[PDB]
Amino acid sequence: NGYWGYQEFLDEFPEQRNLTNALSEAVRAQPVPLSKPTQRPIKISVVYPGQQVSDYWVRNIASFEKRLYKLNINYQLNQVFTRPNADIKQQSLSLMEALKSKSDYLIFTLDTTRHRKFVEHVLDSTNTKLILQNITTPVREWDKHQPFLYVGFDHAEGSRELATEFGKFFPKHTYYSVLYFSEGYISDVRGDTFIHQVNRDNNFELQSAYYTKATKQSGYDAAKASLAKHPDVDFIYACSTDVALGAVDALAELGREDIMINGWGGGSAELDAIQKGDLDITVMRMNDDTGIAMAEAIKWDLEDKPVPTVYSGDFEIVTKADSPERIEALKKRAFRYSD
Ligand SMILES: OC[C@]12OC[C@H](O)[C@H]1O[B-](O)(O)O2
């Protein structure tokens, strides 16, 4: 809403579908170093959220840097971390701070319904080229000047896949509860998608939905509260890794192994929980592809080639029944750079 669907957007602009497809080919393919030399090293800023159970961000940067090295790109990387739970006001402060650096590229994430126009005005202000992480759905308003790249693993797709699995695990009319992220974009695209699908297709009944602070502790708290008010459910759908892992501790504490719970993203900690059996299911994203895509995107730009506006990587579904070999194989695929 105010957003294009990833696939919708690629349909509407064929040239974009081409560029994105070309890029995915450039990601799958072996590194091809930089065609066009530079006058100086390029300066890149990263404003990321810190201290999360989720290893997505650190892995992203890892695979990113490794790719830039492989491409023979000479970069200087200024990192900044936001402590938690950093207010959106604080995050955007960290952001303005990173803008002073007058970098060539600026990689970051910010909730883009709660700070739509802010980011728009930032886009208008600088010559720094923006990379928006963790959003794969372009904003309609910004068709005049879109950022350099939205990069991520489509939230709607991953939530569709999970909805598809839950419809597979349970009868029509099954009771469940939902643990959202914080109020915002992510909860809208991960949560409300899942709920829409599961209500329409499987006639599931949503007992309750709770917002969180996007932290493990918060996930624990919200799970406890929710199950206190609404004990009778067959699963809980969680919108992020940290919240899921908190909810697990809650379900253990409460003795509720009659309740099923999913992860989101399938990083190391989730996979470990899946192998313990603490986590019933997850949608594991092929993590490093987006780190590698950003480096390929920068390469092109420096060769003066056109760059796609968006890139989404792919998911696989992982269940606690999967073989160690399949898990291992998927790690081989997903962390092929960050290990
Ligand atoms: O992609 C990163 C992320 O999205 C929200 C949160 O920051 C992370 O937790 B997650 O569930 O692993 O996915």
Swiss-Prot record:
Q: Which GO terms describe its molecular function?
A: DNA-binding transcription factor activity; transcription cis-regulatory region binding
Q: Tell me one Pfam family matched here.
A: Peripla_BP_4
Which GO CC annotations does the UniProt entry carry?
A: periplasmic space
Instruction: Give the gene that encodes this protein.
Output: luxP
Subcellular location per UniProt equals:
Periplasm
Assigned protein family: Belongs to the bacterial solute-binding protein 2 family.
Instruction: Give the record's keywords alphabetically.
Output: Periplasm, Signal
Task: State the function annotated in the UniProt record.
Answer: Binds to the signaling molecule autoinducer 2 (AI-2), a furanosyl borate diester, (3a-methyl-5,6-dihydrofuro-[2,3d][1,3,2]dioxaborole-2,2,6,6a-tetraol). This complex then interacts with the LuxQ sensor protein.
Check the record and name the PANTHER family matching this protein.
LACI-RELATED TRANSCRIPTIONAL REPRESSOR, RIBOSE OPERON REPRESSOR
Q: Known InterPro entries for this protein?
A: Peripla_BP_I, SBP_2_dom
Q: List the disulfide bonds.
A: none
By what name is this protein known?
A: Autoinducer 2-binding periplasmic protein LuxP
